[PDB]
Amino acid sequence: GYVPAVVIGTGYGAAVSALRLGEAGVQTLMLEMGQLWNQPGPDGNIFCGMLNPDKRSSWFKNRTEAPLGSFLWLDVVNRNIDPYAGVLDRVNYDQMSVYVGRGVGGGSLVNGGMAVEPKRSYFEEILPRVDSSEMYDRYFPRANSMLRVNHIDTKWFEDTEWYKFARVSREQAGKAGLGTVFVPNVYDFGYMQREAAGEVPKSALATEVIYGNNHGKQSLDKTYLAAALGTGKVTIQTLHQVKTIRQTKDGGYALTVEQKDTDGKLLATKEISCRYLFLGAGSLGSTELLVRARDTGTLPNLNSEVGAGWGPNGNIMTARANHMWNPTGAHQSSIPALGIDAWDNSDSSVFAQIAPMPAGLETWVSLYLAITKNPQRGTFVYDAATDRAKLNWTRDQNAPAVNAAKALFDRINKANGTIYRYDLFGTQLKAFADDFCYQPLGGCVLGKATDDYGRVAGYKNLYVTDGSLIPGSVGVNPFVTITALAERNVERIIKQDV
Ligand SMILES: Cc1cc2nc3c(=O)[nH]c(=O)nc-3n(C[C@H](O)[C@H](O)[C@H](O)COP(=O)(O)OP(=O)(O)OC[C@H]3O[C@@H](n4c[nH+]c5c(N)ncnc54)[C@H](O)[C@@H]3O)c2cc1C
């Protein structure tokens, strides 16, 4: 049927767009290919933890996987599973694996909650056509309030066993002249204290994050999407995947939409049409819809920039072996709290998360997720034979990222007399994981595939709202930028177009 506005997906861009549309009185339907995560599973919890993965952990996989960095300790808990509409999807391309959330809330279900505004001078570099004053004066503050960003108590942080891992890396970094910063989060740190005191059910302190948090984490279903539903003008249909988009003869857009069950069985294919169409299917999903539409002739006036400009936000993972006198602890909160800020907008820039590990026993390992400045980009290109977007990225394109991460951590190793671990990512000696991404950015870049507000070039009333807009890098964990940019864009679109 017809609905005035459709939003594809229910991640950050989608959730912002739907809230503001509803508040503007536009009846809006959100279509989400994953589940609404609200039914208790066979253990009484909605989500599985990292030490007890089951089918809920994985989008249509036949075996669970260990969280990257953790295979040496967590492969022992892996099991064969039925393919199922689980919450975390590892999307494998020829030389890159991209991890994305699947469900109402998107990646907000599975992410580490780190809520960070980019450095203004870097924002100005990457998006020179955007007025940065509005962003820092209005839209970034609006996003941090709406998202429920909060800050860890410093006294508790300093005292608790659950953050010893972070304090160890702070001390080691300090010996190399590097400081750390507290990273704000959407996980409720007051709740986390009470977890440690035994007062409330544990989630972050019970090795949960990457397959969902049963408590504490204010994912988008609790913040923007709850508010959007509260407008009385928004509905969400789950297990509905948009497959094609065309521009109707009489105006507007029509979608082919597959309804599946949680085993993946096709139940129905529906046509749904609208006046205004907003894509919030993520860097991967929005870009795939648009290259498909261009290259199958259903949106033939899309430009050549659709598909281009993808990058993994410079993501590299590495680890250091601590001295025996610097144990990182058996008890590590699953929510990071500290990063190493060595980002100066130069090519040696690194913003590194001090990442917890879920082993649950002492391993002496310090794990890091580095965000770097690597100019290399990939392109999604339509494969008509399999009807999929393929990401043309090669592992050598991450060499500048590896090089930047290694130069920073080599300074830390030199100052402390420590070495890398080489065995955390496979049998081959490899200290740097360079073929994954948690933070995909680009494919429908703002100002190149779209105007400066996400209006898709060549079309009216067709909008992209999500990480596909970002030109491959923001220098920090991206969801606050996605959210703020979506606030800016939908406000303008409603004022001028709706
Ligand atoms: C393990 C992990 C850790 C991360 N840690 C952080 C962190 O602490 N801080 C940070 O800032 N970022 C973090 N990220 C990245 C962050 O979650 C991500 O940048 C955003 O979620 C992207 O938001 P979008 O709105 O672009 O997109 P996203 O949240 O991926 O939402 C897209 C939604 O669209 C749905 N969808 C896709 N295709 C279709 C279709 N054709 N039809 C229907 N529905 C569809 C999809 O299932 C999903 O719910 C992390 C991500 C992962 C996977």
UniProtKB/Swiss-Prot annotation:
Active site: 353, 439
UniProt entry keywords in alphabetical sequence: Cholesterol metabolism, FAD, Flavoprotein, Isomerase, Lipid metabolism, Oxidoreductase, Secreted, Signal, Steroid metabolism, Sterol metabolism
Keyword Nuclease in record: no
Location, primary (coarse class): secreted
Cited Pfam families: GMC_oxred_C, GMC_oxred_C_1st, GMC_oxred_N
Pathway(s) where this gene product acts: Steroid metabolism; cholesterol degradation
Posttranslational modification: Predicted to be exported by the Tat system. The position of the signal peptide cleavage has been experimentally proven.
Cofactor(s) named in the record: FAD
GO cellular component, one term: extracellular region
Binding site for FAD: 12-13, 32, 107, 111-112, 114, 242, 467, 479
Subcellular location: Secreted
GO molecular function: cholesterol oxidase activity; flavin adenine dinucleotide binding; steroid Delta-isomerase activity
InterPro entries noted in UniProt: Cholesterol_Oxidase (IPR052542), FAD/NAD-bd_sf (IPR036188), GMC_OxRdtase_N (IPR000172), GMC_OxRtase_C (IPR007867), TAT_signal (IPR006311)
One biological process term in Gene Ontology: cholesterol catabolic process
E.C. number: 1.1.3.6, 5.3.3.1
Known catalytic reactions: cholesterol + O2 = cholest-5-en-3-one + H2O2; cholest-5-en-3-one = cholest-4-en-3-one
Record has Transport as a keyword: no
Similarity field: Belongs to the GMC oxidoreductase family.
Function recorded in the entry: Bifunctional enzyme that catalyzes the oxidation and isomerization of cholesterol to cholestenone (cholest-4-en-3-one), an initial step in the cholesterol degradation process. The cholesterol degradation pathway allows the bacterium to utilize cholesterol as its sole source of carbon and energy.
Subunit structure: Monomer.
Official protein name in the record: Cholesterol oxidase
Species for this entry: Streptomyces sp. (strain SA-COO)
Protein's gene: choA
